């Protein structure tokens, strides 16, 4: 019905595997849920790219 998100998906999963400091089973997790509902693609880069910016080599 209602069309919300096309390549934002794939590209989600792509930014979050593609984060250098992203501990693994981190990377894991986000994609788990990215695939049990891609609608939390943007909140999973979120924390991701938090927690790849936390696991900085700062």
Same mark, same amino acid.
């Given at each position: 019905?209602?069309? *919300?998100?096309?390549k934002e998906?794939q590209n989600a999963?792509y930014?979050?595997?593609? =984060? ?23 909140? =999973?880069?979120?924390?991701? *790219? *938090? =927690? ?7």
């Amino acid at each position: 019905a209602d069309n *919300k998100f096309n390549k934002e998906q794939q590209n989600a999963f792509y930014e979050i595997l593609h =984060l250098p400091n992203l501990n693994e089973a981190q990377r894991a997790a986000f994609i788990a849920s990215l695939a049990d509902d891609p609608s939390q693609s943007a909140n =999973l880069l979120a924390e991701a *790219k *938090k =927690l790849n910016d936390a696991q900085a080599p700062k």
